[PDB]
Amino acid sequence: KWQFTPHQHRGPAEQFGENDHIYSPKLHNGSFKSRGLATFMGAPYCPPDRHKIREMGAKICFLAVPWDQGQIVRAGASQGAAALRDATTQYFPYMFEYDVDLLSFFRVVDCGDVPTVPGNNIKSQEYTADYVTECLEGGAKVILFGGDHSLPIPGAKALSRFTGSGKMGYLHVDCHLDAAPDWAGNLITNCSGAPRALDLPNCNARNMAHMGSRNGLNPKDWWDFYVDNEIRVVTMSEMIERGLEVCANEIFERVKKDTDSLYFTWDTDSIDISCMPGNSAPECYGLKGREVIQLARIAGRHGCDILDIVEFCPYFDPSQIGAKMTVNMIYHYLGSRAQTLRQQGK
Amino acid sequence: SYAHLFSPLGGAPGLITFLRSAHVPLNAEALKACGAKYAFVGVPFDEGNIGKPGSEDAPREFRLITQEYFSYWFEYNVDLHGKAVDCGDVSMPKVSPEVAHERIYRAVREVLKSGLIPIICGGDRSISITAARALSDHIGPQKKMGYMHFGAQLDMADSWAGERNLAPCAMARITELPNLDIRNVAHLGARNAMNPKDHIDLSKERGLQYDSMFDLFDAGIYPLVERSIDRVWSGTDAQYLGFNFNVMDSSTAPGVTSTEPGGLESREMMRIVDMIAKRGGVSVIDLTELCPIFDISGTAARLAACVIMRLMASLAAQDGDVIDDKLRRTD
Amino acid sequence: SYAHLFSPLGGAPGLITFLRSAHVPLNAEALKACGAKYAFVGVPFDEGNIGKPGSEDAPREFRLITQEYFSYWFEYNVDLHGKAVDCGDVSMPKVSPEVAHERIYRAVREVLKSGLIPIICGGDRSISITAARALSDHIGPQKKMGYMHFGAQLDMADSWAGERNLAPCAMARITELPNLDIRNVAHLGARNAMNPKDHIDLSKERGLQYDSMFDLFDAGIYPLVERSIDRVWSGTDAQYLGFNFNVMDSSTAPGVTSTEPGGLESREMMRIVDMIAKRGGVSVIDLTELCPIFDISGTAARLAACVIMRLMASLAAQDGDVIDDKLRRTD
Numbered sequence A: 001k002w003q004f005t006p007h008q009h010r011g012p013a014e015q016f017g018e019n020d021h022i023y024s025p026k027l028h029n030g031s032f033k034s035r036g037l038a039t040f041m042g043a044p045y046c047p048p049d050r051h052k053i054r055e056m057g058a059k060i061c062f063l064a065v066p067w068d069q070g071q072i073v074r075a076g077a078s079q080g081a082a083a084l085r086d087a088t089t090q091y092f093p094y095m096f097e098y099d100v101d102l103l104s105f106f107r108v109v110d111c112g113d114v115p116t117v118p119g120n121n122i123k124s125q126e127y128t129a130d131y132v133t134e135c136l137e138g139g140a141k142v143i144l145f146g147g148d149h150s151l152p153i154p155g156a157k158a159l160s161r162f163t164g165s166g167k168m169g170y171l172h173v174d175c176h177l178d179a180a181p182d183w184a185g186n187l188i189t190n191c192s193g194a195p196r197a198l199d200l201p202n203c204n205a206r207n208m209a210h211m212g213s214r215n216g217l218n219p220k221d222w223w224d225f226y227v228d229n230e231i232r233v234v235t236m237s238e239m240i241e242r243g244l245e246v247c248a249n250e251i252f253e254r255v256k257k258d259t260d261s262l263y264f265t266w267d268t269d270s271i272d273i274s275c276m277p278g279n280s281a282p283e284c285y286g287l288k289g290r291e292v293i294q295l296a297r298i299a300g301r302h303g304c305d306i307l308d309i310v311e312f313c314p315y316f317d318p319s320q321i322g323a324k325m326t327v328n329m330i331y332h333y334l335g336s337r338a339q340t341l342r343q344q345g346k
Numbered sequence B, C: 001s002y003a004h005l006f007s008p009l010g011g012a013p014g015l016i017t018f019l020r021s022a023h024v025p026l027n028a029e030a031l032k033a034c035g036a037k038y039a040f041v042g043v044p045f046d047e048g049n050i051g052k053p054g055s056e057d058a059p060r061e062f063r064l065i066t067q068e069y070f071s072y073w074f075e076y077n078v079d080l081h082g083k084a085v086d087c088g089d090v091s092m093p094k095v096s097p098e099v100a101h102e103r104i105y106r107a108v109r110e111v112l113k114s115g116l117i118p119i120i121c122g123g124d125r126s127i128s129i130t131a132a133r134a135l136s137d138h139i140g141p142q143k144k145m146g147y148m149h150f151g152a153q154l155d156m157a158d159s160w161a162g163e164r165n166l167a168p169c170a171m172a173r174i175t176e177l178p179n180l181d182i183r184n185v186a187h188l189g190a191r192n193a194m195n196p197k198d199h200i201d202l203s204k205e206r207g208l209q210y211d212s213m214f215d216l217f218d219a220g221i222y223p224l225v226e227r228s229i230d231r232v233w234s235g236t237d238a239q240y241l242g243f244n245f246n247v248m249d250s251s252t253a254p255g256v257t258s259t260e261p262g263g264l265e266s267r268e269m270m271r272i273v274d275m276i277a278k279r280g281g282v283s284v285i286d287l288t289e290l291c292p293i294f295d296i297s298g299t300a301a302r303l304a305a306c307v308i309m310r311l312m313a314s315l316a317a318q319d320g321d322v323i324d325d326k327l328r329r330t331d
């Protein structure tokens, strides 16, 4: 059930070789110039089904959620997943910085895309919950690739249900606070990730945190939410003042303390516009390139159950910089997770 | 009403104005009456520019970018609603430079008469010559002016291509203003090769104490900026603050008429903005040489907007002009 | 006459050349006579490229950006006028790499014969294999060569697709040159996952002491760079310096064959350039894998240009080859 061809290509010059995927390609160029039929990481395709995932023995599911009609700003995040997948052909699944083969370590699979019902945010969000559910119930941790920032509403909801009587942490990294109680009467748009997590029966204010805030696309009520509910906000200001590693470790401890699971949503507009022009609402005064990698590394050491990444818009990026940045967000999280796991006898 | 501070509750197509400001004519009496602290004036004038074209579209793009932000700035607990008005644009002829400048002059004098702070959006950098002259004349010979400008180019050409009021001459003119002592002048960010030897020679001759980008990095930036803020604001009656965003690193501000590697990061400029705000006021704010045809995702225009609006927010915070913390949406 | 040092005074078909250099044919006698220290050599060869296409246009796009810059660098008190010439592009056939490489080889040998420093602009990274071989042969087995390359990729494929001279093989071939001791080899900036396990294995096997980007960040960058500069320049007769500008953060270098997030920022590479220049010479300067179709408002090409020109300026300052302070404009 769990197989892939190293360097993609079958036919006469197929490569066979248990480990060929972590080494220079031997018979041909693989997909480094031409994409062909690339999955995320060249991983096996596996339907988002608990049985199929289980029998493959997959511990990470890449699942795209391109839904971009749950949001208040501008469409475009629907195109991100394709550019992320394409960008992975520009890397090997082996990461020398961590000495791990990500692909075999996690038995990662690509669960394709969650389908959408254009115009219907309610039904599309339900599909997301259900697709995520299959991944968890199959015994895997999930990488969710958006799609607009409505994604954590179904994402957290799904992990909330799977966690049961246990407790769940919620980390939200973003230049925007995302705590509208409603937007023009709507409870489930892309700017209500945090209040909707707090509503989940097993998600508690003391295990919730926000990082990345700056600038004036942040109504007072979004700030008020964190004040009134005693939820830690670490502004970009504080992360620069006090240091990324200091602030990250502190809030990863907070959101994991006496929790069974952790939901981590990461908006690419947390990244400085200089590094990520391809975004729904890009913002200056954000994470630098090296700091994005560092945060991914730190996130990896602590670990989460679902990591989601939202709002990448490749149309507003004429280069490869956005897509490759989003590849590294994921690959550094997995490389760091694996190294941390291996330093504990696993 | 304070509904604008908060998410819309739900249940007249407006205008291209700085910050969704009201329009108010370029008239001292109307301006004093309106109750705002700042008056935005566009100046799509391009004819001092010896380099790549595009700055005349900056005022439109700058306005548009500003529309995208709420007026509320949670970091400062400040609301910018009503603090500014937009006077629209100084109408220019063409192939008519002398008259163009005269019109800019009149526009700035008028705004200054009102007691409001002009925010002047170019257009090329030469517009700073005549905006600075206007402040000079406004305050008169018995008062003291300070000048601070951010940019990669000194612009200290005594003359350029036989002319005297092109953008590369701008500092050579401004430092000749009679009530502007060279000791109250700062220039921050100069670097790279768009700085011919005579600009250096003249600067030394006049004792222009510019803070090159090398000097800034070597000092850890902020301590040297602080001393130059001091020289410009201590014992002056009025201060002019100008920005060419090629002070910033290219990556941070591509959409400028002459980008330059090796400049300020956005977070450095935001710290600098707060340091300027500590002094609790400014007389004229200019930004020149935005060039949106060369901008990617409006990165430069976006950054300019953040810088200008944070400066407004920061001045208001230090002035105590905050909003009520206690106020909530369910009111 | 020194009119180019100063603001311009005012009052036939060209070529596009590095820095508006004179053209000088690829001839040792002509090059020796022309009086320049550097010869720009374009190499629009992309047939060792395993990645996305576009590098073939880099030499033209690089030259164009350089035409914009004045030749005087106030930060160094140096003028670059006359310091370089452009030898045009190596004439190479399509679909015959073996012959193309032979012609690159010969062109580089020729410039080295002239005593001038070749500045070689790719094109793909594999052109460095044969430019380095040219230097190796040019100094002969009596001499010791040093090699320093900046990039995000080790390029230590013994073979790639059964081939041996493609871009990701470049380092595997260069470190087999007989008069280049591995201890005199530096490689700075390797990061992210375009670095398969065999590249690491071979590196260990041969004792390539590469400075990964993580190593560099951990050390504050410059302390570790200085160590590797010393290994390359101390006790060597000639030094090869090469740049894939994916060493740089994506933000400052989008327009490259294979961008990489989390790399050097512009001011950091500038500092590094001055650290290199303190050693008072280089034998060959290469830059490969610029890729204009991916660039954002010329950002990568503009950074490359500013890096190459500051290196020139910085080397001149170290050699005392500065401009007379007493020189003035209206002479």
Ligand code: NI
Pocket: A149, A174, A176, A178, A190, A191, A267
């Ligand atoms: Ni968001």
Ligand code: NI
Pocket: A149, A174, A175, A176, A267, A269, A270, A281, A311
């Ligand atoms: Ni956001």
